[PDB]
């Protein structure tokens, strides 16, 4: 019923059938009970459907090392669409489906269980979007300019780990921090790759990182335009504005790369002002 309600079988009246399927999912889904709890058949059905949508992904490695993707991109798209249509179905019926809205111990764990599944769904969609973003770039190029531990972590990274384990999230945060670096070398567009990472895979990307990426953009593009005289004083001055904003949140690894570049461009006095500013914003109370 859940599947039909989400449009499955419709690749073959159809609104009424899907509305009937919705009615069957609500009316006959059961309820949670004390036996440790026994969750409703409605919950197990949602878990069963979701699992079967990602069964080809879960235990599979993300990549195959000339690195490529284990799962074809076209398959990742359809899986994501199916997960999203399931999410859309739960949102449009948050008020009528038991357990979605907040509610005694039985209905409590029913709400917690259903909530956890929905958080996994959005994490699945974010994870898939991240993999698609990754292979839109030149991963082999990114994979080359990488440390061994992170190459090994990426070698045996599964979709399960990407979706549900901190190391996948931490590694994802490293890869995004690396792809933008490379994107700046190609230099097609920084602010487009920004809004790409900002929204779709939000909750895994950080807005303090994109402003940093915007700063490293002008820095590298100030090294690109380095031969020009009057164009840099606008690039380096605007890079400095971007750095000082995220001063209370710059990593020592980035702050160094910034100062290293400033010295190449004889921007001595400016680089000193950034480090002084980063200091005060890490310890405002002095």
């Amino acid at each position: 019923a859940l599947a039909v309600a989400c449009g499955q079988g419709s690749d073959l009246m159809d609104r009424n059938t899907e509305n009937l399927a919705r009615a069957a999912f609500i009316e006959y889904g059961g309820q949670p009970r004390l036996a440790s709890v026994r969750l409703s058949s409605r919950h197990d059905a949602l878990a069963l459907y979701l699992t079967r949508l990602v069964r080809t992904l879960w235990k599979a490695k993300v990549v195959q090392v000339d690195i490529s993707s284990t799962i074809p991109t076209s398959k990742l798209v359809t899986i994501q669409e199916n997960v999203e249509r399931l999410r859309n179905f739960l949102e449009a019926n948050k008020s009528t489906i038991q357990g979605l809205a907040p509610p005694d111990i039985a209905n409590q764990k029913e709400h917690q269980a259903l909530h956890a599944l929905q958080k996994l769904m959005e994490s699945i969609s974010e994870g898939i979007s991240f993999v698609l973003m990754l292979f839109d770039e030149r991963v082999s190029d990114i994979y080359a300019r990488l440390d061994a531990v992170s190459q090994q972590q990426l070698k045996d990274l599964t979709y399960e780990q990407l979706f549900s384990q901190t190391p996948g999230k931490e590694l994802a945060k490293v890869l995004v921090k690396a792809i933008v670096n490379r994107n700046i070398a190609s230099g097609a567009n920084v602010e487009t790759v920004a809004d790409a990472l900002r929204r779709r895979c939000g909750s895994f990307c950080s807005p303090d990182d994109v402003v940093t990426f915007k700063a490293q953009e002008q820095l590298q593009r100030a090294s690109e335009q380095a031969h020009n005289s009057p164009v840099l004083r606008a690039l380096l001055a605007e890079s400095l504005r971007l750095f000082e904003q995220v001063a209370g949140s710059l990593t020592p690894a980035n702050l160094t790369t910034a100062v290293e570049q400033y010295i190449s461009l004889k921007y001595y006095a400016g680089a000193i002002q950034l480090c002084l500013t980063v200091a005060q914003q890490k310890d405002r109370g002095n």
Binding site: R221, Q225, N228, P230
Partner: protein
């Protein structure tokens, strides 16, 4: 001495220009004699003389009255072209320093073609796609943005290349544009000029693609 560094350098240049006329020599280019000092100052002044030279570098009628040259429609027309050529080239330098941090930096790697420069200019000034654009894209950028900033830089050829790769999408605009690039003085024939204006005025007076409106 009551003369500042800049003023003094100009005086020396005006002494030369006088020494030349006092000894009957060739009348040298005064505008060049003044820009020689400008380079010793910030580019605020150099870019001025660049405009002065290009605005005065018009074919004149030697030994003709001043008022006559400036009233003649002949000369008044070339002024507009010399200015447009300055605004286009001036903007083209803005597009370089926007992509590369320094003019020198752009030169060492080589000034790219006006088309690839403009494309590498759209990447920055519009990173995300505006939802109101029309007529699709061309190699990853809206077709009308490319046409505008190419015309703005003054490379009509680069703009026409963009049109050639979107023949199906742009409709009848191809035969109209190809006439604009051919006809001199940046003007179309009254008949064809009438055909496009009425079309734009008909249902495109307010279009969601500003670049389309501009072109």
């Amino acid at each position: 001495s009551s003369l500042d560094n800049i003023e003094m350098a100009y005086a020396r240049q005006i002494y030369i220009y006088n020494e030349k006329i006092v000894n009957g020599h060739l009348q040298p280019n005064l505008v060049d004699l003044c820009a020689s000092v400008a380079e010793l100052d910030d580019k605020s002044i150099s870019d001025m003389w660049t405009m002065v030279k290009q605005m005065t570098d018009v074919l004149l009628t030697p030994a003709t009255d001043a008022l006559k040259n400036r009233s003649s429609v002949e000369v008044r027309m070339e002024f507009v072209r010399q200015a447009l050529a300055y605004l286009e080239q001036s903007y083209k330098n803005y597009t370089l320093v926007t992509v590369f941090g320094n003019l020198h930096q752009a030169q060492l790697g080589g000034v790219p073609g006006t088309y690839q420069l403009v494309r590498s200019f759209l990447n920055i000034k519009l990173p995300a796609p505006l939802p109101g654009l029309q007529d699709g894209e061309v190699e990853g950028h809206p077709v009308w943005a490319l046409i505008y900033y190419c015309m703005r830089c003054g490379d009509l050829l680069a703009a026409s290349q963009v049109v050639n790769r979107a023949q199906h999408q742009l409709g009848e605009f191809k035969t109209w544009f190809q006439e604009y690039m051919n006809s001199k003085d940046r003007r179309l024939s009254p008949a064809t000029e009438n055909k496009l204006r009425l079309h734009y005025r008909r249902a495109l007076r307010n279009n969601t693609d500003p670049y389309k409106r501009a072109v």
